[PDB]
Design a protein. Sequence first.
Length: 295
Amino acid sequence: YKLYIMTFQNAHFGSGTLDSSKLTFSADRIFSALVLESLKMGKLDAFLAEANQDKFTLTDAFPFQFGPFLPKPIGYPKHDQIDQSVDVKEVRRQAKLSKKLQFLALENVDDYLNGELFENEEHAVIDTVTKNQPHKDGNLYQVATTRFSNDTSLYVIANESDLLNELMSSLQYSGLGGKRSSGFGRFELDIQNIPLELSDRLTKNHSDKVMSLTTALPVDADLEEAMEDGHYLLTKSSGFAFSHATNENYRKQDLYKFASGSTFSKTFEGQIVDVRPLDFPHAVLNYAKPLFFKL
RNA sequence: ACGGAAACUUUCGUAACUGUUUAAUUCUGUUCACUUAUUC
Ligand SMILES: Nc1ncnc2c1ncn2[C@@H]1O[C@H](COP(=O)(O)OP(=O)(O)OP(=O)(O)O)[C@@H](O)[C@H]1O
């Protein structure tokens, strides 16, 4: 499998509320875009039977600035791995920056566990604008933008085949998150040849102090042993559904999954949960497959 | 089958009303058109 490289600028990626926005984005945001364009193109009965093929998976948002970036491990270092806090004045001034850290570089994935505390590089500044609506007198909303600079890209790793190359190629001329009606979500698809020789520790078999990402959800069956002696971080993601027959826009059920970079100790399974409020002619399904890293 | 769908910071209104580039001011102070000469 290969990987896709794309960048964003002057876009919008909300989180929780329409007026609020963040830098990265969840993993289920990409999967919800390929299904919408499959019915419009003419292959709805072909993309549904491809995502549930086990070997086909997706990733979350990862920055790309002169090298790939990886999230920090949750829980590391522990109380014994970290150095002894002899002087509390010199430890509290550097331990707070590790909690607010976003992502780590590709050359610091092996030295962070031995003792390395530094400030993360600033990706982009948060910019916001304002609009209104004349001929109404009674509407004033606030929206934000994600204007990236200093060469900031958000690559994605998927399973390259003879059908995926024709699906995500037309996505750059559309939108992905934020105000799509204005033109927030366009990117530039860039393909290469030989992937990175360093980030090749992705497997789904053994479980020897691994770490699952992509903000996946564990299976409903095995959970007592997988969650035991582990860590996670609950998030928040909800919203209305996409349909054309219903005239009420029902609110979908929330799916408080985990976060990226959560360490565990047992191989998960990764199933497909069905979320249906009342009734819909289509089918709302969740993806987010876990990906383990050897660390 | 996307915290996404739906949206003009819009209409508004001479940078304007009075004001001599002028007040003071001899293109003139000195200056033979001439030295020499029988209309017989
Ligand atoms: N009066 C108090 N008694 C006990 N604990 C306190 C009191 N005031 C604050 N704290 C503790 O201090 C913590 C907040 O620390 P704070 O964020 O102010 O550190 P900081 O000033 O940012 O550190 P630095 O200056 O190194 O950045 C809280 O978790 C709280 O438990």
